[PDB]
Amino acid sequence: MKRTFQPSVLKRNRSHGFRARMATKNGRQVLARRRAKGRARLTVSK
Amino acid sequence: AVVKCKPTSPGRRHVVKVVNPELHKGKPFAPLLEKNSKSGGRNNNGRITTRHIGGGHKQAYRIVDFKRNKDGIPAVVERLEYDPNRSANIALVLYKDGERRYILAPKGLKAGDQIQSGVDAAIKPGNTLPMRNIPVGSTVHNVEMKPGKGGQLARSAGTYVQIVARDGAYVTLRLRSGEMRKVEADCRATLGEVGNAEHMLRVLGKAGAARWRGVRPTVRGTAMNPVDHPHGGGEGRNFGKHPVTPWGVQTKGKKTRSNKRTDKFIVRRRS
RNA sequence: CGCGGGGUGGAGCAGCCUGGUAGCUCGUCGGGCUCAUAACCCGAAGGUCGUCGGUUCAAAUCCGGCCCCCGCAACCA
RNA sequence: CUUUAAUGUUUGAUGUUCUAACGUUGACCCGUAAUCCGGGUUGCGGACAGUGUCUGGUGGGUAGUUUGACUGGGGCGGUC
RNA sequence: AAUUCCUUGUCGGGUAAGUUCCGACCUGCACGAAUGGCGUAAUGAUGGCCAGGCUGUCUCCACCCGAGACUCAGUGAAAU
RNA sequence: GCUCGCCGGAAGACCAAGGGUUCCUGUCCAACGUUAAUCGGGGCAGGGUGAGUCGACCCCUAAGGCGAGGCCGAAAGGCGUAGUCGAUGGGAAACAGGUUAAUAUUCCUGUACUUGGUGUUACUGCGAAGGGGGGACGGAGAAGGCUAUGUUGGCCGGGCGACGGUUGUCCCGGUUUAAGCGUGUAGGCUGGUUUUCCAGGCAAAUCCGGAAAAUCAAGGCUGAGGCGUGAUGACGAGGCACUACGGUGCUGAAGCAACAAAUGCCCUGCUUCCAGGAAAAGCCUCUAAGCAUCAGGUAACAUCAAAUCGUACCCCAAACCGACACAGGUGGUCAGGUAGAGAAUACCAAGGCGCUUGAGAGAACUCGGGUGAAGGAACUAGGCAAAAUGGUGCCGUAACUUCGGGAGAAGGCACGCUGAUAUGUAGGUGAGGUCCCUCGCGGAUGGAGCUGAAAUCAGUCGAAGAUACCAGCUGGCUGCAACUGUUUAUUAAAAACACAGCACUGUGCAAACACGAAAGUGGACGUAUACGGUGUGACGCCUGCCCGGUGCCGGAAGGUUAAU
RNA sequence: AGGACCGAACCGACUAAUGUCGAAAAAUUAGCGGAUGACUUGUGGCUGGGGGUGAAAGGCCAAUCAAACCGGGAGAUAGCU
RNA sequence: GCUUGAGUCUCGUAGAGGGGGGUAGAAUUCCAGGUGUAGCGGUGAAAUGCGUAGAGAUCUGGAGGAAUACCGGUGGCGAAGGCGGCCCCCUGGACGAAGACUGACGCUCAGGUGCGAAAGCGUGGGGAGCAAACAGGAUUAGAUACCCUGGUAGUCCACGCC
């Protein structure tokens, strides 16, 4: 079997990346909530 | 020509090819080529609009001269090349001054036949000239719909429209569907009938034959569930409904002739 | 067991619905046409309206029991 | 009052023609090396087409719901 | 009959014995001609039946080789 | 450390991805490891990743994304032109050896290469977001020439050997060498060169293309490997020398031939068929607006620059994905010996491991298996499971059929080893010698050596010669479906779906239909021999009657008929 | 030449045993089907909730699908326990 | 050897012999418009059907497929089946004329080969008229017949088969 998660960081940053978020309006709402909730790990990064 | 293969393999016993020895066995004139990356029956929004379209073999798009604006210049057809995008054989001709172009090859066209376009050409297959010079009763193809459009009518294998009459300005063309159309005499038209007329006998013989062509399997509505198609459902083959399309529109005899501005051009509908 | 319909001269069918009067075709009988039959033409007879009872001025008919026939149903584990 | 002829007048219903509304996913030029698009020439159609508002029709393509109770389990039959 | 309720219908073949199988009879509850009909070489990890072959499936199980099971030392759960 | 046993087209050795110090050394044992543990992918501390040539970054595109203006939409926002991004694609250049506790095509030794700046010398016209060439391309098939690699022989070095033999046809180990440069072959492609002219290449063009002629017959492009050179160099088995006893220092003979031969290379070839097989840049070349005592370009030489980032370790798994040190899953490359058709399989080399609970006992019973007298499906829903058949050459082969098949039908015969034909044949490769030459990597001729099936006869061994692993059960009748294929990922693989074919029907292109408030796209850069929908589902013989109900199509005279 | 045949890797998943608090939230073993094609697979994009995609099973859309997950209406309503 | 068999050459004759590529006129059907108005078509009679949504009658034009009036005759050609509007090209056979040449090369002919009306069959076009089958209307004791209105395949063209 193949458990549903075989990673590839390029596709990870293309879908959940900072710029992948900031480029759209809906993404801008998310970080607004993330900063308000005070979560340190806003997105996926290094 | 048409030939039937020997029944060696199951799926070869029904294969009939349209072999033609005069087809150039090499690669085409590069400067008249550009990629034809497939769409997959998908629009700008990625949704599948037209079904049954996908897969198929990758083919490059050739550039065909439909307009024929090079007037008063003779041309010599070099080789009848094959084109993947159409069902008609194309001919790579070379103009007297030195320009090479592709045009749909007529029926009676051999290697080396002299052809020229323009408003003062001789009555010979392959020659292009406005319809107010063509004799009444003659047969042409690649008819230009609007003046300068390029050509919209009769462009497939063994296709030809017949010029019936000339109502002064408008000329009456009896189209391929047996429909009477009206078009202006200013438009150009190429003499003769499109070649490779054996396309009607070319049977595919096997299932994969449609796959590499680009055709994808068609699932009937009688097999699907009622949630996926207006038909379907029931415990074992129960059509019982008036035949329709996947979107409710009743098929099998429902006219969708709705343009209304082109009714002034149709003399007699397709009967 | 239940629901719907039906039983009309010798036979197959109208008419019942919304009651007082029973028609059509074939068949039958007698005559005629032909040398004889059929066919054809003319005339006529024949119906307890399944059976009983109630209701009604009056019952093929309205209502109910019963007999026979036809169709459906007789299902879910 | 009826049948009615000419004139003036009033609008409706069709036919034909025209060009200026408009369409132009026809050709050409410029903005611009750009097949988007805009502007300008020219041709083809033409007060159509198309859009908006009101309106009759078709309409399970689509949506929100209804689909009784009693019942010696329910259904059917029967009843209210 | 992938369809025949009645039915294991009737007859014949196959078996010592055949509610299934094969070929016919038509009494088709309720087959049927593109919701296609009747056949069809080849193909099928397809449905049913038969014969040969070969065997522990079985008549009837017997012995033996290994991993657990059992005992000792260490670690050490679970449903309830 | 000495034996034993296992994988060995992997359980080996390297990368991408993905993790993130797990790599190496010292030390420690509570917690972690399904047990102990001075052990470890565990804790602590320290150390380790060196690049002009590898890869990314960078130059340039695909799918597709974002998108100035613009069009469109209550707003958000959608699409899209110029552009600009985006590899899994194309584009410049390095190989051998040595060295560490851990890194090395990156450091050192030796020998080379590429892209540019600046300057000098000698010459010459250069110059685009513009044109052309090139880059540049499909599947399959077979052949020829080689290499990686392997075997044998020769040679060199060591041994002559704890139970009989072994100075000989004996045994064991080794016999390694690249990039680049020159030569430019086997082979492949193509007729060269010069003069004139031209509505062609958005303008121009000496370049490309085309149309007339002359002269001569070759010239040119491309190309693995071979031979020199690189290299009187490195390496090299075994000795010689010191032991912290792990290893270091020193030295170092032979280093060739023949044959067999890949799926690797020439080959991004050639032939053939069809379903007809990216784009742009770097590079080369031609010129425009222009600039010309210039600037730049070509060649040679000197010098400088080649930055930033990754580089450790794991990478068919105790580190990735599965909560775990989990019998699962994970793309690419190299891939030897014997037998064998083979990357199957059996046993081994290199190398890596014995799977992190063991020790006794040998009951029932359970699982993984062997054998089994007599019978041989009587078992049972049913031959489910097991058993059995199983290879190669040849003999022989039915009903039926679409004349291809059916068929490897079925059913049989010979299979080991030794000698002989022949101190190893037919065949393959092929040196020395001889001759010629348009002289080189040449062609004829020549045949030693090397190598090696298969057929027959004769003899002999066992119960058994495809002796193991490996490796079809066959046939008769018949239902359904034509056939390969697809499907309920995780109970249904089928008669279901798909299928080419056939028919009906809609659509004249601003096409129908479809996504979409719209614009715009798909359909299609196709156009009735086309596209969409529906139905049936190869093929053969056919495909009957009905327009009442319903839907659909056509025609409108009348009745009815909303808004206005 | 072949949706050709036998048969590895690769892909798939027909039969049986074991497993069922498993080694594993569908695997292992012994046999199987395809294996030049409608083949398989890597990397990277595109299509999305009454929508997507579908050789069509009402299967698949992150171990969840006759309508996914997360948050908000919302302490929904419940003649019921 | 010869020649009276047979065959070949020179000059001409008549012709629907065959194959291929074109063209003309009449008529029928349908479509379009105008003129114009109550029946048209059909039969022994009648009806189904068509028509006042305006047919038929009539004039002009156009699209079409098929057959070739008069010439035409127990006339002609070819082996036979069979073949006729006309034009062009290719091509076959028979006969007459006055001579020459080869010199029996002959006659028939199982098996075999080829050609061979119509109908019928496969693939692709075409489709006016006519017309299997079929339906309806009559006649009839019955009419799945003869009669009448429509009418699919086919009849027409190309390549094969029987």
Structurally, how many domains does chain B consist of? 3
- Residue A46's domain comprises 1-46
Q: Are residues B183 and B206 in the same domain?
A: no
CA-to-C1' distance for B181 and F159, Å?
Answer: 107
Q: Are residues B131 and B105 in the same domain?
A: no
- What's at B210, amino acid-wise? A
Could you tell me if A35 and A27 are in contact, meaning their C-beta atoms sit under 8 angstroms apart? no
Q: Over the range B113-130, which residues count as b (16 or more CB within 10 Å of their CB) and which as e? A: bebbbbeebeeebbbbbb
Q: Are residues B142 and B107 in the same domain?
A: no
What CATH number should be reported for the domain holding residue B45?
A: 2.40.50.140
Q: B208 phi and psi, to 5 degrees?
A: -65, -15
CA-to-C1' distance for B204 and F179, Å?
Answer: 55
Q: Are residues B209 and B228 in the same domain?
A: yes
Spatial distance between the Cα atoms of A39 and A31, rounded to a whole number of angstroms: 10
Whether CB of B43 is under 7 Å from strand E: the answer is no
Whether CB of B242 is under 7 Å from strand D: the answer is no
Which nucleotides on chain E have any atom < 7 A from a protein Cβ?
35-36, 41-43
Q: What does the block give as tokens for B126?
A: 């392959």
What CATH number should be reported for the domain holding residue A35?
A: 1.10.287.3980
Q: Are residues B189 and B229 in the same domain?
A: no
Q: Are residues B213 and B182 in the same domain?
A: no
Q: Are residues B83 and B134 in the same domain?
A: no
Q: Are residues B257 and B152 in the same domain?
A: no
Could you tell me if B170 and B155 are in contact, meaning their C-beta atoms sit under 8 angstroms apart? no
* Phi-psi domain of B261 (left: phi exceeds 0; alpha: psi -120 through 50; beta: other): alpha
Could you tell me if B181 and B163 are in contact, meaning their C-beta atoms sit under 8 angstroms apart? no
Q: Are residues B106 and B36 in the same domain?
A: yes
- Out of B194, B216, B247, a domain closes at B194
∠ CA B20-B32-B68 to the nearest 5 degrees?
Answer: 85
Could you tell me if B190 and B128 are in contact, meaning their C-beta atoms sit under 8 angstroms apart? yes
Whether CB of B44 is under 7 Å from strand G: the answer is no
B263 SS3 class: helix
Whether CB of B145 is under 7 Å from strand F: the answer is yes
Spatial distance between the Cα atoms of B105 and B93, rounded to a whole number of angstroms: 10
Whether CB of B220 is under 7 Å from strand F: the answer is yes
Q: B254 phi and psi, to 5 degrees?
A: -115, 110
CA-to-C1' distance for B185 and F555, Å?
Answer: 35
Whether CB of B260 is under 7 Å from strand D: the answer is yes
CA-to-C1' distance for B202 and F180, Å?
Answer: 59
- Out of B113, B145, B180, a domain closes at B113
Could you tell me if B239 and B224 are in contact, meaning their C-beta atoms sit under 8 angstroms apart? no
Structurally, how many domains does chain A consist of? 1
- Residue B227's domain comprises 195-271
| Nearest nt (C1') from B238 Cα | E35
What CATH number should be reported for the domain holding residue B258?
A: 4.10.950.10
Q: What does the block give as tokens for A14?
A: 């293309």
Spatial distance between the Cα atoms of B131 and B140, rounded to a whole number of angstroms: 9
Q: Are residues B270 and B205 in the same domain?
A: yes
What is the C-alpha end-to-end distance of chain A, expressed in Å?
30
Q: What is the resolution of this structure in A?
A: 3.6
- Out of B94, B113, B132, a domain closes at B113
Which residues from the 208-237 window of protein chain B have CB within 7 angstroms of nucleic acid chain E?
Answer: 222, 237
DSSP state of B194: B
CA-to-C1' distance for A43 and F92, Å?
Answer: 40
Could you tell me if B171 and B184 are in contact, meaning their C-beta atoms sit under 8 angstroms apart? yes
Q: For A46, what's the count of Cα atoms within 13 Å in the CB-facing half-sphere?
A: 4
Spatial distance between the Cα atoms of B228 and B193, rounded to a whole number of angstroms: 45
Q: A12 phi and psi, to 5 degrees?
A: -70, -45
∠ CA B253-B49-B229 to the nearest 5 degrees?
Answer: 55
DSSP state of B264: G
| Nearest nt (C1') from B212 Cα | F275
Of B217, B219, B218, B224, nearest to B241 by C-alpha is B224
